[PDB]
Amino acid sequence: QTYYRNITEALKNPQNVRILNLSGSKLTTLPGEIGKLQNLQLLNLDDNQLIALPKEIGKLQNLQQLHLSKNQLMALPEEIGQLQNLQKLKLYENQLTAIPKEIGQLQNLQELNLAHNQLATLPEDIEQLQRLQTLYLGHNQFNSILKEIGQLQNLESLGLDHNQLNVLPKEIGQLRNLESLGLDHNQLNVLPKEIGQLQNLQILHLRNNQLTTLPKEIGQLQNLQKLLLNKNKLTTLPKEIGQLQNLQKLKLYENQLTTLPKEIGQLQNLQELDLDGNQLTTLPENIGQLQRLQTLYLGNNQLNFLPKEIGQLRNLESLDLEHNQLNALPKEIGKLQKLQTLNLKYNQLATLPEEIKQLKNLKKLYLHNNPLPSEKIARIRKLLPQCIIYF
Numbered sequence: 001q002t003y004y005r006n007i008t009e010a011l012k013n014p015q016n017v018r019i020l021n022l023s024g025s026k027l028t029t030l031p032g033e034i035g036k037l038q039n040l041q042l043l044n045l046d047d048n049q050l051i052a053l054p055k056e057i058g059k060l061q062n063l064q065q066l067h068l069s070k071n072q073l074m075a076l077p078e079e080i081g082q083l084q085n086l087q088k089l090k091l092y093e094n095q096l097t098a099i100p101k102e103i104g105q106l107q108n109l110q111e112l113n114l115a116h117n118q119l120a121t122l123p124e125d126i127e128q129l130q131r132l133q134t135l136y137l138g139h140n141q142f143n144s145i146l147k148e149i150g151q152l153q154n155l156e157s158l159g160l161d162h163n164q165l166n167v168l169p170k171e172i173g174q175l176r177n178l179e180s181l182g183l184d185h186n187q188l189n190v191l192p193k194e195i196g197q198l199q200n201l202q203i204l205h206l207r208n209n210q211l212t213t214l215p216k217e218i219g220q221l222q223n224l225q226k227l228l229l230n231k232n233k234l235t236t237l238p239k240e241i242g243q244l245q246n247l248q249k250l251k252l253y254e255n256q257l258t259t260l261p262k263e264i265g266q267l268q269n270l271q272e273l274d275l276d277g278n279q280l281t282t283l284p285e286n287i288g289q290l291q292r293l294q295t296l297y298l299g300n301n302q303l304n305f306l307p308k309e310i311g312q313l314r315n316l317e318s319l320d321l322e323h324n325q326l327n328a329l330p331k332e333i334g335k336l337q338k339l340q341t342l343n344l345k346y347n348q349l350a351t352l353p354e355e356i357k358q359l360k361n362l363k364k365l366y367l368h369n370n371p372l373p374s375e376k377i378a379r380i381r382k383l384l385p386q387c388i389i390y391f
């Protein structure tokens with residue numbers, strides 16, 4: 001027997017215990033005799049009522065994973081640094097206000113989850129975690145993040161969402177292996193120019209911040225695939241945004257954009273462009289160069305017209321133009337052979353181009369709240385028999 005769910009049973013046969021699972025057992029205290037389980041590799045203490053840990057936890061020299069999530073931990077003992085084989089430390093949902101400097105001794109640590117605690121600082125000794133690949137600090141009380149974070153050469157994922165960050169340290173740009181950066185729901189008013197140094201960054205979550213502009217250096221993110229900028233205060237995009245050749249998803253929902261740079265057409269790999277809730281008055285002709293675009297959301301903008309180049313979007317499957325002020329659709333709309341959904345609700349369309357009959361793959365057409373004559377729509381229903389027309 002190597003798997004145990006009971007500490008009393010585990011203590012009768014020590015040197016055999018490899019996994020000790022005590023999750024959801026209303027455990028109020030971990031007995032000091034835990035140190036006797038010399039061959040323990042995984043200790044699961046999740047979903048319990050632990051307020052502290054015994055100093056003897058440091059004796060678990062073979063421990064590779066320590067799961068301590070969803071407890072009421074007020075502090076970690078200095079002896080936590082003695083866990084020289086520890087690769088994963090999970091402490092999400094606790095009441096930690098500090099992390100001991102001895103955390104820097106955990107030279108084998110690959111993953112550290114400190115999300116949902118009450119941390120405002122980290123010891124500078126965090127810079128010694130040169131094997132750390134994943135660091136979660138979301139839902140804490142960081143008003144600022146120490147520049148020593150930028151020293152984590154092997155870091156691939158950094159979670160800093162739901163903190164109180166106004167600014168990022170310029171040293172963040174030294175995370176050359178970073179692939180995912182989570183900054184949702186902070187109060188970021190600006191991004192450092194050094195953000196562009198994150199050459200391996202694939203995913204950047206910046207939703208629900210207070211950004212007004214993006215630095216020109218944002219274009220240096222050569223590996224970026226997903227850029228989530230929902231619910232910020234962007235009034236413009238830098239022309240350098242067009243240098244993001246690997247970008248697949250650009251989410252700009254609920255910003256204050258009035259125009260798009262012509263360089264938007266350079267986004268070779270863009271599949272999804274969400275501009276819902278902006279204040280666009282026009283689209284550049286360059287929009288037609290987005291040959292991989294599948295989804296285009298333009299709801300609640302102020303568009304009066306669409307460029308004829310919209311018809312060049314050969315891979316477009318979904319087009320949302322709800323609640324704009326469109327007076328007409330270009331005849332080129334008929335070239336959208338892959339289009340399946342077209343939402344034209346709440347516009348001022350008094351007519352539709354005859355070329356709409358060429359949309360053989362259209363499945364759903366939303367026309368409610370347009371001054372369209374009923375005879376014209378009845379005729380379109382017979383021209384697109386496979387389409388459901390909501391009018």
Ligand SMILES: [Ca+2]
Nearest residue numbers: 133156157179
């Ligand atoms: Ca990876």
Ligand SMILES: [Zn+2]
Nearest residue numbers: 161182184205
């Ligand atoms: Zn995120």
Ligand SMILES: [Zn+2]
Nearest residue numbers: 162184185208
């Ligand atoms: Zn949030």
Ligand SMILES: [Zn+2]
Nearest residue numbers: 276277299300
């Ligand atoms: Zn909308």
Ligand SMILES: [Zn+2]
Nearest residue numbers: 323324346369
């Ligand atoms: Zn309205």
Ligand SMILES: [Zn+2]
Nearest residue numbers: 345346368369
């Ligand atoms: Zn209605």
